[PDB]
Design an enzyme around this catalytic site. Structure first.
Site, PDB file in Angstrom:
ATOM      1  N   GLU A  35       0.810  -1.207   0.000  1.00  0.00           N
ATOM      2  CA  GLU A  35       0.000   0.000   0.000  1.00  0.00           C
ATOM      3  C   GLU A  35       0.852   1.269   0.000  1.00  0.00           C
ATOM      4  OE1 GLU A  35      -3.043   0.383  -0.608  1.00  0.00           O
ATOM      5  OE2 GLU A  35      -4.052  -1.516  -0.154  1.00  0.00           O
ATOM      6  N   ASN A  46      -7.833   8.730  -5.860  1.00  0.00           N
ATOM      7  CA  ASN A  46      -8.650   7.717  -6.501  1.00  0.00           C
ATOM      8  C   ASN A  46      -9.485   8.337  -7.613  1.00  0.00           C
ATOM      9  OD1 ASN A  46      -7.682   6.337  -4.161  1.00  0.00           O
ATOM     10  ND2 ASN A  46      -9.612   5.216  -3.954  1.00  0.00           N
ATOM     11  N   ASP A  48     -12.622   8.366  -8.135  1.00  0.00           N
ATOM     12  CA  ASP A  48     -13.838   9.021  -7.674  1.00  0.00           C
ATOM     13  C   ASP A  48     -13.636  10.369  -6.986  1.00  0.00           C
ATOM     14  OD1 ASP A  48     -12.883   8.293  -5.178  1.00  0.00           O
ATOM     15  OD2 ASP A  48     -14.555   6.965  -4.687  1.00  0.00           O
ATOM     16  N   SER A  50     -11.835  10.837  -4.203  1.00  0.00           N
ATOM     17  CA  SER A  50     -11.312  10.579  -2.882  1.00  0.00           C
ATOM     18  C   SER A  50      -9.804  10.389  -2.968  1.00  0.00           C
ATOM     19  CB  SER A  50     -11.982   9.349  -2.270  1.00  0.00           C
ATOM     20  OG  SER A  50     -11.609   8.168  -2.953  1.00  0.00           O
ATOM     21  N   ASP A  52      -6.418   8.299  -0.769  1.00  0.00           N
ATOM     22  CA  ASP A  52      -5.956   7.338   0.223  1.00  0.00           C
ATOM     23  C   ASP A  52      -4.750   7.893   0.962  1.00  0.00           C
ATOM     24  OD1 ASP A  52      -7.817   5.428  -0.663  1.00  0.00           O
ATOM     25  OD2 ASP A  52      -6.391   4.560  -2.047  1.00  0.00           O
ATOM     26  N   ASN A  59      -9.052   5.562   2.984  1.00  0.00           N
ATOM     27  CA  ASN A  59      -9.751   6.398   2.027  1.00  0.00           C
ATOM     28  C   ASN A  59     -10.625   7.485   2.639  1.00  0.00           C
ATOM     29  OD1 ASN A  59     -12.358   6.592  -0.037  1.00  0.00           O
ATOM     30  ND2 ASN A  59     -10.366   6.472  -1.084  1.00  0.00           N
ATOM     31  N   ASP A 101     -15.407  -4.031   9.450  1.00  0.00           N
ATOM     32  CA  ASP A 101     -16.566  -3.577   8.659  1.00  0.00           C
ATOM     33  C   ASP A 101     -17.371  -4.702   7.992  1.00  0.00           C
ATOM     34  OD1 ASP A 101     -18.035  -1.157   7.581  1.00  0.00           O
ATOM     35  OD2 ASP A 101     -17.317  -1.955   5.668  1.00  0.00           O
TER      36      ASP A 101
END
Ligand SMILES: [Cl-]
Ligand SMILES: [Cl-]
Length: 129
Positions: A35, A46, A48, A50, A52, A59, A101
């Protein structure tokens, strides 16, 4: 801060990530390697809109506030910049929420694609933990 491999393993262990939700320490080290290269300062935009952040590339849509991600939920209740600190506490606490989650570590694409199913214990070999 760019952590050493065993340095990051020791920090993650101290913060209670080892075996957290059943994920042994090498899973976390492996995920952080791919990562972020163990770099707390890593950021990546990202598609969209957003971004990270940090050693585990958390995110800004769901987890942290970066001030520029419309519809952000900030579920970790932290500015995304907190995830860039040399102190990994905020990243660890937020990762604990993410991994709880429902999808476990499948939340981390790099973990799914590069760590899952591999000999992840290799990531902590040689370390004094
Ligand atoms: Cl392991
Ligand atoms: Cl799981």
């Amino acid at each position: 801060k760019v952590f050493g491999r065993c340095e990051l393993a020791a920090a993650m262990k101290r913060h209670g990530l080892d075996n957290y939700r059943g994920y042994s320490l090498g899973n976390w080290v492996c995920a952080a390697k791919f990562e972020s290269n163990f770099n707390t300062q890593a950021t990546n935009r990202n598609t969209d809109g957003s971004t990270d952040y940090g050693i585990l590339q958390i995110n800004s849509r769901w987890w942290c506030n970066d001030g520029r991600t419309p519809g952000s939920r900030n579920l970790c209740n932290i500015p995304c910049s907190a995830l860039l600190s040399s102190d990994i506490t905020a990243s660890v606490n937020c990762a604990k929420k993410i991994v709880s989650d429902g999808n476990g570590m499948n939340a981390w694409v790099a973990w799914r694609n590069r760590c899952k199913g591999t000999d992840v214990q290799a990531w902590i070999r040689g370390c004094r933990l």
